[PDB]
Amino acid sequence: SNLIEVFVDGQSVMVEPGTTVLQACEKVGMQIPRFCYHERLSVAGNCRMCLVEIEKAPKVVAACAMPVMKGWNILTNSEKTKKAREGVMEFLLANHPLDCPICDQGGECDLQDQSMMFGSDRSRFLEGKRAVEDKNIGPLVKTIMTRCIQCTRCIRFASEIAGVDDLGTTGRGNDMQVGTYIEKMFMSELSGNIIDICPVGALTSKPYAFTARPWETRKTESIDVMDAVG
Amino acid sequence: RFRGEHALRRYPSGEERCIACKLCEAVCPAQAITIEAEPRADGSRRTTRYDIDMTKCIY
Amino acid sequence: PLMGWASTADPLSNLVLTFSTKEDAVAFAEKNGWSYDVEERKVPKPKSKSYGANFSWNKRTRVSTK
Amino acid sequence: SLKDEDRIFTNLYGRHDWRLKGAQSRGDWYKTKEILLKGPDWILGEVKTSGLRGRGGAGFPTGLKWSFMNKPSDGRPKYLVVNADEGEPGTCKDREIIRHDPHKLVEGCLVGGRAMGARAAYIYIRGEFYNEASNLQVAIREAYEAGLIGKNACGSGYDFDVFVVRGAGAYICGEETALIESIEGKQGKPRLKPPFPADVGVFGCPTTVANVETVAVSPTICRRGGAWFASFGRERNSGTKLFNISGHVNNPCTVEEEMSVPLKELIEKHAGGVTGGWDNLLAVIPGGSSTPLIPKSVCETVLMDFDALIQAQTGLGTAAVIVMDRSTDIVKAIARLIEFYKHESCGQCTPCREGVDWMNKVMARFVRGDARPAEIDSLWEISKQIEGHTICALGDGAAWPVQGLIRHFRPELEERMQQFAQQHQ
Amino acid sequence: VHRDTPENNPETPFDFTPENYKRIEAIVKNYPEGHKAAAVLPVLDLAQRQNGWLPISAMNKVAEILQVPPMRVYEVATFYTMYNRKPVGKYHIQVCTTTPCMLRNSDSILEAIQKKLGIKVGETTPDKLFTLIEVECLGACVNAPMVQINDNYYEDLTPKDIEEIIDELKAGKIPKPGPRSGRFSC
Amino acid sequence: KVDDAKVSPPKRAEMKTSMESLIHHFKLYTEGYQVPPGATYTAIEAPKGEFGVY
Amino acid sequence: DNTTYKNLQHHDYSTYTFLDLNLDLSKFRMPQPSSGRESPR
Ligand SMILES: Cc1cc2nc3c(=O)[nH]c(=O)nc-3n(C[C@H](O)[C@H](O)[C@H](O)COP(=O)(O)O)c2cc1C
Ligand code: SF4
Ligand code: SF4
Ligand code: SF4
Ligand code: SF4
Ligand code: FES
Ligand code: FES
């Protein structure tokens, strides 16, 4: 009654038709490294990190794009899948500044956790590194666009859910700046969520700025007051 | 290369070299070094509190 | 008042335990003696996020500017 | 068995004198009333039986590609997309097939109208072509006023009108998803091809993207005999593809030669620079810019075909010739081609926007020769990493030619590296 | 720069079509009303042709007329190479520099054009008549060199002939589809 | 040091230039190694006896 | 066939040739189906 039997590393799993490769892997317990995909946001194949090789295929498909059909043996720990993750990680960090001490995000950073586990130990890189002029977005959100990995997640956030339409890609190749072209002071509702949407230290809270690192502060669960929804 | 006395260095043209990463806090096996970070109102991210107690620290 | 650190008098505070089952964690809390207030695990809801919805004709779910 | 010299009965003929009334005298729109009256099974079936290969820089067969956009039942009205924009540098098929004889491409829109089931047809021209766009619009103005396209087309129920849409100096109109997104209104970035192909979503409609040279073959297969286009060439590759001879040559000219023609005879028929393959150092590209450079050892024996060239580790797709001289630098030329890919990469896939742009910076060092001998062996692995993991095929196109610098070459690269390192240090 | 928008008077002075507004309505009529934001690219091309060197306010006015958000219209204009938004020129001289032209002497044509006009590589002339730019590819690769000016491009040009075409352009515009040989084959 | 920079911290001249090294330097501190789960036992001969690490 | 290029009409073209023809092509043209909405975004 609308269920497809497919294999993740040779293990049987039942899924609804229309679901993505990453959605099927979440059912068994697997988690493919990602940068664009979000549970609440839409689907885009920008970064091409969530590469997972399915057998009897010449090219490796992304976990974002492909919907699961009948009869697929998704191999997560094959020789080509490991080389795909190690490859793109080196491309992502070739044009990204050495800012981990001056970065507002510490242990929470998505680039840090993934590059240690999935990426290579050393980089081939010798010469390059692009530098991006920072744009003052608002007094609530500090913006250093040098660290941005042009993942296109905040642009989708402002367009589809926030519904403000200010952020956008301008330029081609290396010279691509994420943000408002007209230098407009972006202030609206849900603007304090775009700091949490961004996986890297490109967008961060200006009132918080620098106080503690993610690992240093002890987390405690509470319901927020002074709000109707709670 | 000898370890015995704690002292924080600075650049040849003034300016405090320390950045307040708290990196040295996490590695510290005695958990001796305490650090509170704040912006210095002029863009740069540096230190406010920086206590390395010699009651603790196994050098 | 000695320096700047935040010292606490409460001894039992800085400990995090691990458990495999919700029934095992509740039984261990009763075994220790302390009263427990258990919270239900918030499982992520399965949402059908398809790429074909981004290029819609009749639906208003069409993505603007990539 | 061998490919015929030029062929007297050629599909393309408009080069000397044709405007609007001259098209009827030459041999166009002759059986237009009979072709429109015939069903979609007879029109698409004739194209499948002929076995015409893809004229665009992809290599995919047309016979299977047109079958997906047949549409048995659909809510959204089907459209036809004709990408007439210029591809890789070297291929000048766009400037010749549109400016000289525009009615040949317009006949394909009417022949492919009833076959695909299109409500409206789009002809996408590049922003650089404005003189070609003026000739294309004037031919469309003469076609609509006569009473052959729109409302009643050659005595048929299907009404399809062709509209010209001008781009703006972008190479990212190449891919099937890229040309669809450019006409959609959003930024010129290609959508993901695996989940939603051309037949799934293009301007919110099931459409089919086709090259101008591929669209020109459709009235040639319909009006003239299907065996006439099928017999000329090879067994696997069929149809006369216009290969433009360019680069370091005394007389550069675009010729409408038959499929599976030898490269040594192709240069002789168009008159080359120093020699056909003896005097000058042969590093001629079998494709426009996407294909890797072919060596002097394997050039005369190899034939310029859609399938046969790929077996010799040099897949020709764009169908263009780019010959290099002995005096001209090989390293400096291809480094400019990578710099071309740096300017023309869209900026989505991180192995392309941070890959090809990084590849150009390493290649800039190779021109001056300030690189280690180990750097040549490394760069071959990076090019392998880019090729497999991309949305569009520009990541492929910036990976193949740089691999051609590793294969058959390398004594040319090491001599440039060792002499410059010894002189500087 | 492809991101920075300074306030040196491109934000306040606005330009609008007085008679060409009817032509803009016909351009919007070609594409269907369902997703009418498709007209954003041809209307901006008509706006750039009406007035060279596009200001910020004209992009905002084009977005307002087409009912589109100003961020989407600004991102589209910044993406494409054909639009001029930073410099102004009466005849923008764009010369091809790619390998199919570079191997058949394009640098010789580039050096001769730089010496005769006065421009270095990318900077506009002090007289504001010519603007030099290193273009990727003009399209017509059949001719050995290629140089584009304003609307029409000059194919197959000698270092003396291209300088003669630039000198004539100051007084009277010459068509010249190919001032060397025949259009088809040589 | 061990050839893999995923376990051994990188050299000071090496870490200040390349991105991958500085992340590995940042993550080998604060966080440990992320060890494989299980139980090991070693006893290398001390002059006093055995250091039976479990 | 005569040895002369018959493309002299392209040489005598102003700035408004593509935009001018598009307004002129309003007659004898079929209306495009919309069926969607007045404003998506
Ligand atoms: C680098 C590159 C550039 C291309 N440029 C073009 C182009 O300008 N025009 C075109 O019609 N096809 C181009 N193609 C071919 C596309 O894949 C095209 O969308 C489609 O496959 C053409 O189909 P056909 O060969 O059946 O007509 C290009 C392919 C590549 C790899
Ligand atoms: S985003 Fe992550 S990897 Fe980049 S500088 Fe900040 S902490 Fe380091
Ligand atoms: S700012 Fe952050 S969320 Fe936005 S594109 Fe850059 S990395 Fe992605
Ligand atoms: S906080 Fe610690 S690791 Fe960071 S700069 Fe200061 S002393 Fe060094
Ligand atoms: S391969 Fe390059 S040009 Fe093609 S979609 Fe990806 S980033 Fe864009
Ligand atoms: S996370 Fe899937 S492509 Fe980026
Ligand atoms: S490469 Fe110069 S015109 Fe195409």
d(CA G33, CA G41): 19
Give CA D62 to chain center in angstroms.
13
d(CA E137, CA D87): 10
D34: Cβ–Cβ under 8 A, 6 or more apart, which residues?
none
Give CA E177 to chain center in angstroms.
18
What's E17-65 look like in SS3?
A: CCCCHHHHHHHHHHCCCCCHHHHHHHHHHHHHHHCCCCCHHHHHHHHHH
Which amino acid, one-letter code, is at D64?
L
Contact D262, D304 (CB under 8 A): yes
d(CA G14, CA G8): 14
Which residues 173-232 of chain D have a CB within 8 Å of chain A? 187, 189, 192, 194-195
Decide if E139 and D246 are in contact by the 8 Å CB cutoff.
Answer: no
Which amino acid, one-letter code, is at E176?
K
Contacts of G32 in chain D (CB under 8 A): 120
d(CA A210, CA A216): 12
- Compute chain E's Rg from CA coordinates: 19
Beta strands E91-96; E130-135: pairing state = parallel
- If phi over 0 gives left and psi between -120 and 50 gives alpha, with beta otherwise, what is residue D203? left
Which residue, among D338, D331, D316, D343, has the nearest Cα to D382 in the 3D structure?
D338
CA angle in degrees (0–180, nearest 5) for A44-A200-E3: 75
CA angle in degrees (0–180, nearest 5) for D102-D131-D109: 25
Token readout for D403 is 């691999």
Which residue, among A148, A110, A48, has the nearest Cα to D349 in the 3D structure?
A48
Cross-strand bridge partners of residue D83 = D124, D211
One DSSP character per residue, chain A reads ---EEEEETTEEEEE-TT-BHHHHHHHHT-----SS--SSS-----S---EEEESS-SSPEETTTPBP-SS-EEESSSHHHHHHHHHHHHHHTTTS---TTT-S-STT-HHHHHHHHTS-SS----S-----------SSEEE-TTS-----SHHHHHHHTS-----EEEEETTEEEEE-TT------TTTTSHHHH-SSTTEEETTTSSS--TTTSPP------SSS--
Which residue, among D5, D12, D6, has the nearest Cα to D215 in the 3D structure?
D12
Distance C8 CA to ligand 1 centre (A): 70
Token readout for B12 is 């040849």
Contacts of F24 in chain A (CB under 8 A): 115-116, 121
d(CA C54, CA D68): 21
**Considering only alpha carbons, which residue of chain A is nearest residue C39?**
A221
Q: Terminal CA-to-CA distance of chain B, rounded, Å?
A: 13
Which residue, among A3, A104, A8, has the nearest Cα to A53 in the 3D structure?
A8
Only one residue has tokens 């103005």, namely D141
Only one residue has tokens 């009763």, namely C30
Q: How many CB pairs (< 8 A) connect E and G?
A: 55
What DSSP character marks residue B13? T
Q: How far off is chain B from F27, nearest CA to CA, in Å?
A: 10
What DSSP character marks residue E124? B
Which residue, among F32, D204, G35, D193, has the nearest Cα to E33 in the 3D structure?
G35
The H or E element spanning position E143 is none
- Cβ of A156: how many Cβ atoms within 10 Å? 25
Residue A49 Cα distances to A32, A92, D335, angstroms: 9, 9, 28
Contacts of E72 in chain C (CB under 8 A): 64-65
The verdict on A156 touching C (C-beta cutoff 8 Å) is yes
Q: Which pairs count as long-range contacts for B48-57, CB under 8 Å and 24+ apart, including other chains?
A: B49/C4, B50/B8, B50/B18, B51/C3, B51/C4, B51/C5, B52/B6, B53/C3, B54/B6, B56/B30, B56/B31, B56/B32, B57/B6, B57/B28, B57/B30, B57/B32, B57/B33
Contact D166, G18 (CB under 8 A): yes
Chains A and F contact (Cβ–Cβ under 8 Å for 3 or more pairs)? yes
d(CA E147, CA E177): 11
Q: 3-state DSSP call for residue D422?
A: helix
- Cβ of D289: how many Cβ atoms within 10 Å? 29
Residue B18 Cα distances to A212, B40, G21, angstroms: 15, 13, 68
Contacts of D205 in chain C (CB under 8 A): 57
Beta strands A73-75; D243-247: pairing state = unpaired
d(CA B39, CA D99): 64
Decide if D134 and G2 are in contact by the 8 Å CB cutoff.
Answer: no
Q: What is the rounded (10 degree) CA torsion for D343, D348, D350, D356?
A: -20
Token readout for E5 is 């928008």
d(CA D81, CA D175): 12
Residue A158 Cα distances to A194, A197, A199, D307, angstroms: 8, 11, 15, 47
Token readout for A42 is 């839409």
Token readout for B30 is 């005695």
Token readout for D246 is 């360019």
Strand boundaries in D49-197, DSSP class E: 79-83, 120-125, 162-166
Q: What are phi and psi of A116, to 5 degrees?
A: -70, -40
Beta strands B45-52; B33-39: pairing state = antiparallel
Q: 3-state DSSP call for residue D81?
A: strand
E98 Cβ inside 6 Å of ligand 7: yes
Longest alpha-carbon distance in chain D: 79
**Considering only alpha carbons, which residue of chain G is nearest residue E174?**
G11
Which amino acid, one-letter code, is at D370?
D
The verdict on A79 touching D (C-beta cutoff 8 Å) is no
Q: 3-state DSSP call for residue D265?
A: helix
Q: How many Cα atoms sit within 13 Å of A110 on the Cβ side?
A: 21
Give CA E175 to chain center in angstroms.
17
d(CA E157, CA E169): 15
- Cβ of F8: how many Cβ atoms within 10 Å? 13
Cross-strand bridge partners of residue A177 = A170
Q: Which of B21, B23, B37 sits opposite A211 (nearest CB)?
A: B37
Contact E38, E68 (CB under 8 A): no
Contact D386, D356 (CB under 8 A): yes
Contact D174, D183 (CB under 8 A): no
Extract the annotated binding site of D for NADH. Answer: 54-63
d(CA C52, CA D177): 13
Residue D117 Cα distances to A227, D175, D196, D207, angstroms: 55, 22, 20, 10
* CA nearest ligand 1 atom 3, residue: D174
E178: Cβ–Cβ under 8 A, 6 or more apart, which residues?
E143, E154, E155, E156
d(CA D302, CA D312): 7
A58: Cβ–Cβ under 8 A, 6 or more apart, which residues?
none
Answer yes or no: is B39 a known binding residue. no
Contact A17, A4 (CB under 8 A): yes
To the question of domain D20-231 being in CATH 3.40.30.10, the answer is no
- If phi over 0 gives left and psi between -120 and 50 gives alpha, with beta otherwise, what is residue D117? left
One DSSP character per residue, D39-80 reads -HHHHHHHHHHHTPPP-STT---HHHHHHHTT-SS-SSPPEE
Give CA D54 to chain center in angstroms.
9
Give CA D174 to chain center in angstroms.
9
d(CA A201, CA A105): 5
Q: Is the dihedral of CA D135, D138, D144, D150 positive or negative?
A: positive
Contact A166, A158 (CB under 8 A): yes
